Amino acid sequence: AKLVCYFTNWAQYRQGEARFLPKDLDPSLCTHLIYAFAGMTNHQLSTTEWNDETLYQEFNGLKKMNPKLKTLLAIGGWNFGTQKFTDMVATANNRQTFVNSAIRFLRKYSFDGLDLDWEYPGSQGSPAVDKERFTTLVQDLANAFQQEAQTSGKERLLLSAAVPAGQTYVDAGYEVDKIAQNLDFVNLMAYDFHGSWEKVTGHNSPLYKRQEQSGAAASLNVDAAVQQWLQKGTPASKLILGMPTYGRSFTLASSSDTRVGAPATGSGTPGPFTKEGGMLAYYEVCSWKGATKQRIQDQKVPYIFRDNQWVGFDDVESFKTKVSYLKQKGLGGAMVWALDLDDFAGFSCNQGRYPLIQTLRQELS
Numbered sequence: 364a365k366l367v368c369y370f371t372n373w374a375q376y377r378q379g380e381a382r383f384l385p386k387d388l389d390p391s392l393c394t395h396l397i398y399a400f401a402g403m404t405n406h407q408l409s410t411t412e413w414n415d416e417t418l419y420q421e422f423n424g425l426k427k428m429n430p431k432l433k434t435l436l437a438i439g440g441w442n443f444g445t446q447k448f449t450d451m452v453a454t455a456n457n458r459q460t461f462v463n464s465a466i467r468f469l470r471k472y473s474f475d476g477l478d479l480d481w482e483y484p485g486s487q488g489s490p491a492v493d494k495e496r497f498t499t500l501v502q503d504l505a506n507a508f509q510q511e512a513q514t515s516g517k518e519r520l521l522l523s524a525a526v527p528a529g530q531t532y533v534d535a536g537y538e539v540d541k542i543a544q545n546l547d548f549v550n551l552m553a554y555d556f557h558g559s560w561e562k563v564t565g566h567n568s569p570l571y572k573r574q575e576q577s578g579a580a581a582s583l584n585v586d587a588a589v590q591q592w593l594q595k596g597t598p599a600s601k602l603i604l605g606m607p608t609y610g611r612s613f614t615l616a617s618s619s620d621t622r623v624g625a626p627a628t629g630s631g632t633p634g635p636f637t638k639e640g641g642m643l644a645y646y647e648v649c650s651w652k653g654a655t656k657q658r659i660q661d662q663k664v665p666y667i668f669r670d671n672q673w674v675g676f677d678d679v680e681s682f683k684t685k686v687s688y689l690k691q692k693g694l695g696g697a698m699v700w701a702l703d704l705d706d707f708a709g710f711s712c713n714q715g716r717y718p719l720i721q722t723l724r725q726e727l728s
């Protein structure tokens with residue numbers, strides 16, 4: 364089974380023990396390391412930090428200590444927008460300029476592949492025409508990769524894409540069946556099902572729905588998302604089940620009501636290290652002493668509160684549950700976002716180095 368893990372190149376700017384660089388990486392924890400994020404400039408793949416070339420080197424140099432490791436560069440991201448993608452896949456000469464840059468770029472720095480993260484083809488300002496232009500971009504990359512591999516005599520560059528769980532987004536821009544044939548694997552983003560944008564406390568990554576949910580409110584869980592991709596043409600073995608090492612917080616309207624559906628005045632207090640309200644790294648949900656942990660029986664995931672702060676998250680237990688669910692489903696493995704937010708150095712949770720992902724590796728291997 365695969366254990367696809369995302370490294371993010373902005374974690375390097377966090378303060379103290381939270382600061383994360385390639386040296387904090389474990390060459391053997393995951394089967395595949397994906398580097399987030401690379402941008403675009405002139406329909407060309409490009410860096411985004413003043414030190415991406417150096418990080419690329421450390422990132423890929425890890426394969427010397429573990430030749431079985433497979434690295435990939437991810438282009439895109441939630442905050443990338445759709446603009447540059449839609450424009451690049453607009454014309455042959457543009458798709459080509461990109462593809463050729465992708466190849467030359469990946470080889471230049473020793474990346475084994477490209478992981479597409481366009482959020483999302485068919486929404487956020489993307490014309491429904493971008494649904495099929497995506498499928499082209501995929502076939503194009505796949506083809507140039509297969510041709511390159513033969514002419515260069517190296518291991519064929521790998522192709523993957525991060526995909527949304529939501530029925531709406533899938534329909535809007537994904538030809539599931541046709542892209543799955545050209546994608547080496549699909550990284551399903553089964554999380555963010557609920558967040559501080561909604562007005563009621565819900566879980567970021569529930570495995571199952573609560574008895575109390577009917578309709579589209581039901582689908583807002585892992586299983587629905589998984590079943591949707593399978594039932595639409597995705598070979599189970601290519602579908603990698605994503606899990607989060609972060610949870611989503613809410614500020615409670617009243618600490619008298621702390622259940623999973625209670626009224627929330629908005630996002631939760633920013634975490635001292637992540638400093639982005641409405642989300643919290645797993646290592647921040649540990650420092651929480653004098654708080655109350657509970658399980659959401661129906662969803663198989665935990666959540667906790669201390670006063671007016673409510674946070675739905677994943678722990679070792681919920682990760683074990685999930686690893687078991689994908690196994691029962693015959694999925695290709697797990698995906699995790701991100702190496703970064705787990706307690707990667709055992710500096711907070713007193714469970715060691717990478718408690719969550721180490722859990723994934725052992726339960727999977």
Ligand SMILES: COC[C@H]1O[C@@H](O[C@H]2[C@@H](O)[C@@H](NC(C)=O)[C@H](O[C@H]3[C@H](O)[C@H]4N=C(N(C)C)O[C@H]4[C@@H]3CO)O[C@@H]2CO)[C@H](NC(C)=O)[C@H](O)[C@@H]1O
Nearest residue numbers: 373437439440441442443480525552555609637639642700
């Ligand atoms: C660390 O928070 C502050 C930091 O955010 C940067 O933007 C990123 C964050 O908002 C990420 N959010 C979380 C909870 O990690 C966000 O993560 C997204 C990612 O875009 C999507 N891609 C994938 N996969 C698997 C390919 O998964 C999704 C995850 C989880 O929802 O990513 C955005 C960046 O796209 C800020 N940077 C930017 C460019 O906005 C900035 O660094 C800020 O300080």
